[PDB]
Amino acid sequence: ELLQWFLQEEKRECFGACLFTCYDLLRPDVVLETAWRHNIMDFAMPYFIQVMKEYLTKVDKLDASESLRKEEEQATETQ
Amino acid sequence: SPRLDHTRAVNYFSKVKQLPLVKPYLRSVQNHNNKSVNESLNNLFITEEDYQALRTSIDAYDNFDNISLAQRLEKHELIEFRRIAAYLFKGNNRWKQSVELCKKDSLYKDAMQYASESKDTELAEELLQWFLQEEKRECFGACLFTCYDLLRPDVVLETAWRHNIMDFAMPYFIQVMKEYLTKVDKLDASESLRKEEEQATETQ
Amino acid sequence: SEQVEKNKINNRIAXXXXXXXXXXXXXXXXXXXXXXXXXXXXXXXXXX
């Protein structure tokens, strides 16, 4: 709602489409695209999009970690 | 009808230059799936220019030489059969139809649809790699490719970086796979917590 | 006559669901239809 408006009436969209993102993720793909339909140019900024990247690369760290947890104990107690 | 062998008839017609009279004789018949039927029958629908029948004349009965038949069709000018010879050769086998294209019969249309059903994944790189050097609808190309599950991996998403600096912005799909690989992640984190929850419970 | 006549007529008139849509959609780059709306809207929507 806010963002869609930022576009047609303001330019700080940067701080807009950004402070939005950094909090968990409430700014999904749905919004990251809504901006394309329109603005070919205007979109480069990222601070946040990557905050979620290795975030979704770290939760992946610990996850692969527990995966190996399983693997390790299994192979051990049994072969 | 009942109590003829058919096999010993069409033969007397063909070397007669008069076989078409039997055109309707082939009407209520052709359920026999017999070869002489489809075989010249097609030969008929071919020189006669019939496609509705010819198409339906084979929309069921598959008893024939799935080869040379499409050979005489390709030699045509009227794509009707150069369009079906395309089909006829592909027939429930998609690999032929595409791997046989070039300037001609490169239709910006059906060419962007007969790949989709394929299974030889890499052929996408085949087609796409080609789209680049010879066509521009690469957009619809490199895209309709992607949306079906994922056949357009990282390998291709990059090939375009080294290569074409400019030309690549389009996405509809790359994100379809994004929250897709963010939703399967939803349910997954969900079952992870399933586990957590039950564990901590039964063991607190 | 008629067939060769029917011939020229062409070259003369100018999951499943998702696929069909994208197809009957094309024309995107033709002029960036996915900007005007059609292409972009349809695709994104029935594509997620």
CA–CA distances in Å: residue A17 to residues A10, A42, A44, B173: 12, 11, 11, 21
Which candidate from C3, C23, C34 shows the least CB-CB separation from B78? Answer: C3
- The number of C-beta contacts closer than 8 angstroms across A and C is 9
Is C42 touching A (CB cutoff 8 A)?
no
Rounded to whole angstroms, the Cα distance separating B73 from B80 reads: 9
Cβ-Cβ contacts under 8 Å, B171 against chain A: 33, 36
Rounded to whole angstroms, the Cα distance separating C44 from B19 reads: 56
Q: What is the dihedral of CA C25, C35, B125, B81, to 10 degrees?
A: 30
Rounded to whole angstroms, the Cα distance separating C23 from B1 reads: 47
Q: Are B175 and A29 in contact (CB under 8 A)?
A: yes
Phi, psi of B83 (to 5 degrees): -95, -35
Mutate to test the interface with B, among C29, C35, C45, C46 (most CBs of B within 10 A): C29
Is A70 touching B (CB cutoff 8 A)?
no
Interface of B with A in 154-193 (CB under 8 A): 169, 171, 175, 178-179, 182, 185, 192
- Over A11-63, what HEC string results? CCHHHHHHHHHHCCCCCCHHHHHHHHHCCCCCCCCCCCCCCCCCHHHHHHHHH
Which candidate from B78, B148, B180 shows the least CB-CB separation from C7? Answer: B78
Give resolution in angstroms. 7.9
Q: Are B43 and B65 in contact (CB under 8 A)?
A: no
C14: closest CA of chain A, how far (Å): 28
CB contact under 8 A, C40 and B172: yes
Specify the experimental method.
X-ray
Distance of CA B200 to the CA centre of its chain: 53
**Angle at the Cα of A18 from the Cα atoms of A45 and B152, rounded to 5 degrees:** 65
C32: closest CA of chain A, how far (Å): 10
Cβ-Cβ contacts under 8 Å, C21 against chain B: none
Copy the structure tokens of residue B182.
């963010």
Nearest alpha-carbon partner for B29 in B55, B5, B64, B52? B5
Nearest alpha-carbon partner for A53 in A72, A25, A30, A33? A25
Is C20 touching A (CB cutoff 8 A)?
no
Q: Are B45 and B53 in contact (CB under 8 A)?
A: yes
Rounded to whole angstroms, the Cα distance separating A33 from B202 reads: 44
Is C40 touching A (CB cutoff 8 A)?
yes
Furthest CA-CA distance within chain C = 49
**Quick one: CA dihedral C27, C28, C31, C34, positive or negative?**
positive
Which candidate from B49, B176, B179 shows the least CB-CB separation from C3? Answer: B49
List, in order, residues 6 or more apart from A33 with CB less than 8 Å away.
Answer: B171, B175, C44
**Quick one: CA dihedral C20, C25, C26, C28, positive or negative?**
negative
Nearest alpha-carbon partner for A37 in A2, A13, A1, A7? A7
**Angle at the Cα of C24 from the Cα atoms of C20 and C28, rounded to 5 degrees:** 120
A37: closest CA of chain C, how far (Å): 5
Tokens 């780059």 belong to C29
